[PDB]
Design a binder for these strands. Structure first.
Ligand code: MG
Ligand code: MG
Ligand code: MG
Ligand code: MG
Ligand code: MG
Ligand code: MG
Ligand code: MG
Ligand code: MG
Ligand code: MG
Ligand code: MG
Ligand code: MG
Ligand code: MG
Ligand code: MG
Ligand code: MG
Ligand code: MG
Ligand code: MG
Ligand code: MG
Ligand code: MG
Ligand code: MG
Ligand code: MG
Ligand code: MG
Ligand code: MG
Ligand code: MG
Ligand code: MG
Ligand code: MG
Ligand code: MG
Ligand code: MG
Ligand code: MG
Ligand code: MG
Ligand code: MG
Ligand code: MG
Ligand code: MG
Ligand code: MG
Ligand code: MG
Ligand code: MG
Ligand code: MG
Ligand code: MG
Ligand code: MG
Ligand code: MG
Ligand code: MG
Ligand code: MG
Ligand code: MG
Ligand code: MG
Ligand code: MG
Ligand code: MG
Ligand code: MG
Ligand code: MG
Ligand code: MG
Ligand code: MG
Ligand code: MG
Ligand code: MG
Ligand code: MG
Ligand code: MG
Ligand code: MG
Ligand code: MG
Ligand code: MG
Ligand code: MG
Ligand code: MG
Ligand code: MG
Ligand code: MG
Ligand code: MG
Ligand code: MG
Ligand code: MG
Ligand code: MG
Ligand code: MG
Ligand code: MG
Ligand code: MG
Ligand code: MG
Ligand code: MG
Ligand code: MG
Ligand code: MG
Ligand code: MG
Ligand code: MG
Ligand code: MG
Ligand code: MG
Ligand code: MG
Ligand code: MG
Ligand code: MG
Ligand code: MG
Ligand code: MG
Ligand code: MG
Length: 90
RNA sequence: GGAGCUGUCAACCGAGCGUGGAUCCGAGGAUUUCCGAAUGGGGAAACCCAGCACGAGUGAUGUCGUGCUACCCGCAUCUGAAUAUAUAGGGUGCGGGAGGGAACGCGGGGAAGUGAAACAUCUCAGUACCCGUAGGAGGAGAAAACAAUUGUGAUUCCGCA
RNA sequence: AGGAUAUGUCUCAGCGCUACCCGGCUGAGAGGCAGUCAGAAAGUGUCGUGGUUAGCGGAAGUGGCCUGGGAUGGUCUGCCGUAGACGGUGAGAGCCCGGUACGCGAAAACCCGGCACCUGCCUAGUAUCAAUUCCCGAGUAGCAGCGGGCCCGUGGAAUCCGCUGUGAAUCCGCCGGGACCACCCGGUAAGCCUAAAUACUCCUCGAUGACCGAUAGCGGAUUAGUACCGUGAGGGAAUGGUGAAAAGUACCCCGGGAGGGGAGUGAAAGAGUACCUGAAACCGUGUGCCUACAAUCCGUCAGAGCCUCCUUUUCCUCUCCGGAGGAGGGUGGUGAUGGCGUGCCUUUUGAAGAAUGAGCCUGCGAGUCAGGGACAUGUCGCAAGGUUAACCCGUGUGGGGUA
RNA sequence: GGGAUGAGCUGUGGGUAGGGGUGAAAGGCCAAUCAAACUCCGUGAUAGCUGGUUCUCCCCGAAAUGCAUUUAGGUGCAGC
RNA sequence: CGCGGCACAUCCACCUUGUGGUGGGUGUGGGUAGGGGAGCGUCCCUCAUUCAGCGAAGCCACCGGGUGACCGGUGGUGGAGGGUGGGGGAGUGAGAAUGCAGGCAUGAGUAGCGACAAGGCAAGUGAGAACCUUGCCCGCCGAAAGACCAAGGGUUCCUGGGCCAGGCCAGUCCGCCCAGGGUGAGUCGGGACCUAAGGCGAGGCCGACAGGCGUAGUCGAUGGACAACGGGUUGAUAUUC
RNA sequence: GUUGAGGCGAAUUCGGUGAUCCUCUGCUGCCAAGAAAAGCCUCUAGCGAGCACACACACGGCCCGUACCCCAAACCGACA
């Protein structure tokens, strides 16, 4: 996916819309990501958060506003690189 | 190709790998037990027992590893039984076949039920089935042909008639 | 084929008994042609705007408000579009995601094509005349017998195929034109090869559906040719759905457990792994009415009495009440009692019948399709004309197409 | 109750296959079915016979006779 | 006959004076096989329009409606698709086929609980004991109901757990369920030795094809040949240790 | 003696009866006249310069089965 483990994201749909966090685990096969502070659930002992669908997040470009992800033609060294749209640089 | 991964039922774990590029996708190669046309011999398929050669191992028999060893046909060579010419046959070396596959092709063998308001000619039907044998298709195909007073000009397939 | 006039792709070495003309043959070199082909068979390099086998990029809303667990819904708005295909995402998404239009991409391998190497063929015969001779596919053709097959069932039965017998000729030959004969016309059997137009899909990609949606659709959405049955060849099932997310009920109580209650999660437990919705048969519990002196196809018409819920009167007038209660009127439930009344289907002259069939519920289960078929009709277009079939061209349902 | 040293009983291995086998003979037996086994295929065999054939209302409304028939419980034509 | 509603036909006049409507007379309206005419309901497609997480479908109840098939409104349940109109197409309607599949009744808490050897008490275990464990009595078999094999079966054997399925009752037990363990051969039974009946069968002979038979040979025990006895030991093997 | 394992451990003589077993693949009788091959011994063909034997020591002895039921609740009968 375009959302990686260390990325910081913003929630664009669901109960926790508008919250900010960073990914903790990516599940490319199921198209889910685990983000702290989002849909924390009260499991029974003897509270943690559950993964949300990757469609519900935007990767924050680390420059403020959320954005969609594109790629620039690198390599030139030595492979492809992930950058942003909406004034993209990465 | 680019950040996760160690397939699934099917989770639980355990232990690890990955930007020095994993997992994953494509291509080529290596490995590939035993049975099976099964083909060293045998056999109740997946088991048993060998021969030869070269290696390994043992104090030496035992034991292990790798190759080759069916039958038939064709070709090439050596030999020429009863028997003389010779042939049958035999030895050696090269090639080849065998079996499988859903349908379609070609050649050959070929029912009955049913219909005939009974039934044998007839039909069903050259169908079902069987045998042989292919190819990506096959079969046919280049006039010992049609036509009829004019002419057409190898074959195949479609529509008419 | 063989004879007489009639000549040397280009050259060279040899040879054809010797000196000569004309040669001819072999080998080599020189040129032209063809080539993976039916007409000859392989291989070797190199090059592809070539193709196949992985793939990559790819525009545009974190918009406001309302409802909601959740917006992809409604309403205001902003934008992209060579992209408004499809699918997912917590409910109907072109702008959230995979993607789509469109455009890039191949080490290597394979397929295809090109160019060379390579292979092989061509190395004088052209015409004229002669009409004397030779050749033109043999146990074949023809003929006879018995059969098969042709529209043709043996018929006057040609043409084609098989077995048996007999058995020709080489152009003045032989065969065919539906018995046969004469003439005429056509053709040249008994040797071989040959692309395309045609048939099919185990399989691999990409699409589609006025097709099915879990008793359907494949036997097979589930362990499926499995379980199971048969000695065997064979036969051959049944079983899908929590929730958006396991957040799958911590803890306490009764209980050996099973199970439950309280808490808790969840929008919902009126989703608790026996789980979406949750019908009927069938089985309970509570309750209103009726029923133990009566002979009942079980209903129907007449009909008292109870029970219940609403209203019009006169009464509690406490009345803002509300209505107890009284009467009346009407709903609905039940039905003491009176009359009438022989279940359904099929098959029959005729059945309540002691003729057939049915224990009950739910689901499934029978006049369909094809054809320029045949007859008759309704309707529509054109009209002394109407209409195309195959086929061709188009993204289609459109345009051509006169047989 | 019969035989129980015999034309005996029995174990193991083998052979005969469907118009065929085998039968001291009953049409007996051939995998609980035999006057021609079983399985798959022709095949959705055929049946003048039996059964079944699903929503509604409006108008009209029969026949069980004649002739023929390998015909009589079928069908063709007539009649209605 | 009286009064009211419906329908078909015909007649009489109007409206487009027959595509059909308006009003009024008269006749007619039982019905099997069968013929004609017109409709209801379910599903799918197309065009237009409209409703829907502020709750579609489906189901259930109530209140109403139409000449019939049937329809509408309201509420409840439920959680994603419907309504109407002009057309098009059907796997379009079941109560019967000793129909098929699933579920469930009646018989009914009924018959039966599988030999005529026979059980009892004490103690124990446990939530639970006629059936399980221990002890002691009693009874039965003893040419088997004892002890070994072969064929067949396949883990049923041992130990430790289990108790909702199974055992014709219950079960703490089990040939049931779960995990782990367990089978030791120069001499035993077989092969590596041998052959019978019979099978296959190089060449071969026969047969249109398919194939039939058969020589050399090679398989094939139920038979021939061939070397072990006694004792001990494990929870489970023993002529094997 | 945790009733598992432990430790010790006597006498063992002479008769009777008596086989479906052994001598006996023998013996007798009978007619219905009663497998094969390997194995073993022997003959030579043949091979043959090294042999055959005794003792002692040290070694090699392969593959499959082996649990359990087995007139049964474990096999064939759909069933304990
Ligand atoms: Mg790989
Ligand atoms: Mg072999
Ligand atoms: Mg063999
Ligand atoms: Mg000679
Ligand atoms: Mg083949
Ligand atoms: Mg016939
Ligand atoms: Mg007939
Ligand atoms: Mg008939
Ligand atoms: Mg081929
Ligand atoms: Mg060909
Ligand atoms: Mg991409
Ligand atoms: Mg809200
Ligand atoms: Mg959606
Ligand atoms: Mg879409
Ligand atoms: Mg989303
Ligand atoms: Mg010729
Ligand atoms: Mg002839
Ligand atoms: Mg004929
Ligand atoms: Mg003829
Ligand atoms: Mg002849
Ligand atoms: Mg003629
Ligand atoms: Mg040819
Ligand atoms: Mg062709
Ligand atoms: Mg099915
Ligand atoms: Mg369903
Ligand atoms: Mg079986
Ligand atoms: Mg809650
Ligand atoms: Mg709900
Ligand atoms: Mg629910
Ligand atoms: Mg249920
Ligand atoms: Mg439910
Ligand atoms: Mg009374
Ligand atoms: Mg009476
Ligand atoms: Mg009454
Ligand atoms: Mg009466
Ligand atoms: Mg009668
Ligand atoms: Mg009756
Ligand atoms: Mg009765
Ligand atoms: Mg009667
Ligand atoms: Mg009858
Ligand atoms: Mg009767
Ligand atoms: Mg009955
Ligand atoms: Mg039609
Ligand atoms: Mg017409
Ligand atoms: Mg006697
Ligand atoms: Mg006796
Ligand atoms: Mg046998
Ligand atoms: Mg038969
Ligand atoms: Mg008799
Ligand atoms: Mg029998
Ligand atoms: Mg017969
Ligand atoms: Mg047929
Ligand atoms: Mg009438
Ligand atoms: Mg009347
Ligand atoms: Mg009527
Ligand atoms: Mg009728
Ligand atoms: Mg809601
Ligand atoms: Mg629907
Ligand atoms: Mg509703
Ligand atoms: Mg509807
Ligand atoms: Mg419509
Ligand atoms: Mg139907
Ligand atoms: Mg029904
Ligand atoms: Mg029924
Ligand atoms: Mg009774
Ligand atoms: Mg009783
Ligand atoms: Mg008993
Ligand atoms: Mg007690
Ligand atoms: Mg046991
Ligand atoms: Mg129990
Ligand atoms: Mg019990
Ligand atoms: Mg043979
Ligand atoms: Mg042979
Ligand atoms: Mg033999
Ligand atoms: Mg043997
Ligand atoms: Mg034996
Ligand atoms: Mg034991
Ligand atoms: Mg043992
Ligand atoms: Mg044992
Ligand atoms: Mg045994
Ligand atoms: Mg049994």
């Amino acid at each position: 996916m375009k959302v990686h483990k260390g990325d910081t994201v913003l929630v664009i749909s669901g109960k926790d819309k508008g919250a900010k966090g960073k990914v903790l685990q990516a599940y490319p096969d199921r198209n889910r990501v685990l983000v702290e502070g989002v849909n924390r659930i009260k499991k029974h002992t003897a509270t943690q958060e559950a993964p949300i669908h990757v469609s519900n997040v935007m990767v924050v470009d680390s420059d403020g506003k959320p954005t969609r992800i594109g790629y620039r033609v690198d390599e030139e060294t030595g492979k492809r690189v992930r950058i942003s749209k909406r004034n993209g640089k990465d």
